[PDB]
Structure 1
Amino acid sequence: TLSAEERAALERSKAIEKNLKEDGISAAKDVKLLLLGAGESGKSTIVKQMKTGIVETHFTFKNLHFRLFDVGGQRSERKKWIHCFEDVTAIIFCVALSGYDQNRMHESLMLFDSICNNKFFIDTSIILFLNKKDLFGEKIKKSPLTICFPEYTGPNTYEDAAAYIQAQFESKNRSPNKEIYCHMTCATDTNNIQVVFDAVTDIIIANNLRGCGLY
């Protein structure tokens, strides 16, 4: 048997429990993405296209709600806050192609290797966005590519040089059930958000196929 006070306590508990459930349903329908990369890599440009510590930009595109967490303002050891983002659907990585001469590219290559090989991000797919494609294209004419990579034995032409940097980036992946989606950022069109959308829809389908046993 319950007294008046004990009964009112159970009533309060049940109202809270109802809200807690409703909020959980409407928060499992968002696609959560981690924005990484170097400081002046072109993270800014991607944030702008989608619109102190962590900055969250949420947007709706084609009946699918996205949330993009930027952690560029967290100057600390990556280890101690990288486990918090284990559940993310994909990682968006920004690389400044034209920054190799100014090496900045070598720093980016190292960060990429690390986030591919973390025990928490073994299968989380990466969507790579190679920025400043036009600025790269005009400057390789004068200042070559062999300066950054002595191994480069190919000619200094836009297509071949950009494709070299891409194959070199895709080589760090050493695990299946994990794909890298590289794309040279296309001006200020809605093509950039389309690349994120297509990649997300492809990793949803792949996951379902694996559950059935057909992938």
Structure 2
Amino acid sequence: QRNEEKAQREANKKIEKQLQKDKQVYRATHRLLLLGAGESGKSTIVKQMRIIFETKFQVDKVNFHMFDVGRDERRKWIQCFNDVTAIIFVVASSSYNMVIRTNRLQEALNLFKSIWNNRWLRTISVILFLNKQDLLAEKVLAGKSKIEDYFPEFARYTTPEDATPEPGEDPRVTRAKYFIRDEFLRISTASGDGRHYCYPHFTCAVDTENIRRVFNDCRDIIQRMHLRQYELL
């Protein structure tokens, strides 16, 4: 009879109301993906931000969710993360001399190239973190590992006068850090059509203000996305 149809309609209405509530709850949550090598220091960034691994943290009453897929040389699940606001990329800038066999930093640059020139994620910005700044400073000041020996581009590289360095009190460490950042920026600029941007941040394990950096940067990402959607940028 029609009693079964009426019961099914009532159940459908209840499920639709629950789905509307879930949509309201979920549309305000922003998804972030944490990507990096095992020795990069993603655990340190996760600990700093919190204070598959699912993490809830909110800034200014805005809920962000962070994912950590964690060998997987052929990344086939990278197409699953297509609705995330930004992808957090963590690389140890002090790992230029250490090589496993091809420097680890060069392998991270190749991974960044693969992520950037990905067909499935072409509107997904990348938040770049360079951990182990203190270790990089110690390595550069010591001079045991010549930066030009592993990266030949350092021989002709000059420090950027446009960017004011932090008070590191050493021109050499600033030059090395800015060269490492400029490598990623040069990879990002080649395919940059304005849809997605790469934001380099120099961070340290002692530093804990990375959460505000992520919040502000995600705000800028959404603002740029809206501006390009309305064709004002």
Assess same fold via TM > 0.5. yes
Q: 2:56 aligns with which of 42, 58, 82?
A: 58
Runs of 4+ in structure 1 off by over 3 angstroms are 186-190
Task: Note if contact 1:128-1:182 (Cα within 8 Å) is conserved in structure 2.
Answer: yes
SS of aligned partner of 2:149: coil
Kindly report which structure 2 residues correspond to 1:92-171, keeping only aligned pairs within 5 A, or say none.
Answer: 92-102=88-98, 103-141=103-141, 142=143, 143-153=145-155, 154=157, 157-171=172-186
What CA deviation, in whole Å up to 9, does each residue of 1:21-43 have, x standing for no partner? 11012101011111111111011
Sequence identity (%): 47
Cα distance between partner residues in 2 of 1:188 and 1:162: 17
Question: Who is 2:222 aligned against?
Answer: 204
Mark the runs of 5 or more structure 1 residues left unpaired by the alignment: none
Task: Note if contact 1:129-1:185 (Cα within 8 Å) is conserved in structure 2.
Answer: yes
Q: Which amino acid is 1:175 matched to?
A: G
Shift of 1:75: 3.2
Shift of 1:199: 0.7
Task: Note if contact 2:36-2:89 (Cα within 8 Å) is conserved in structure 1.
Answer: yes
Cα distance between partner residues in 2 of 1:120 and 1:206: 20
Q: Which amino acid is 2:212 matched to?
A: Q
Q: Which amino acid is 1:77 matched to?
A: R
Q: Which amino acid is 1:18 matched to?
A: K
What CA deviation, in whole Å up to 9, does each residue of 1:36-69 have, x standing for no partner? 1111101110111122xx2111111112110111
Question: Who is 2:167 aligned against?
Answer: none
Cα distance between partner residues in 2 of 1:111 and 1:162: 19
What CA deviation, in whole Å up to 9, does each residue of 1:68-103 have, x standing for no partner? 11011x73630x211110111111101111111111
Kindly report which structure 2 residues correspond to 1:63-82, keeping only aligned pairs within 5 A, or say none.
Answer: 63-72=61-70, 75=72, 77-78=74-75, 80-82=76-78
Cα distance between partner residues in 2 of 1:108 and 1:186: 18
Cα distance between partner residues in 1 of 2:147 and 2:73: 33
Q: Which amino acid is 2:230 matched to?
A: C
Q: Which amino acid is 1:111 matched to?
A: L
* TM-score (norm: length of structure 1): 0.91
Shift of 1:151: 2.6
Shift of 1:5: 2.5
How many equivalent pairs are there?
210
Cα distance between partner residues in 2 of 1:122 and 1:132: 29
SS of aligned partner of 1:67: strand
Mark the runs of 5 or more structure 2 residues left unpaired by the alignment: 159-170
Task: Note if contact 1:41-1:96 (Cα within 8 Å) is conserved in structure 2.
Answer: yes
Q: 1:151 to 1:211 in 2, by over 3 A?
A: closer
Cα distance between partner residues in 2 of 1:11 and 1:87: 32
Cα distance between partner residues in 2 of 1:69 and 1:198: 19
Task: Note if contact 2:131-2:205 (Cα within 8 Å) is conserved in structure 1.
Answer: no
Shift of 1:172: 1.0
Cα distance between partner residues in 1 of 2:230 and 2:77: 33
Question: Who is 1:175 aligned against?
Answer: 192
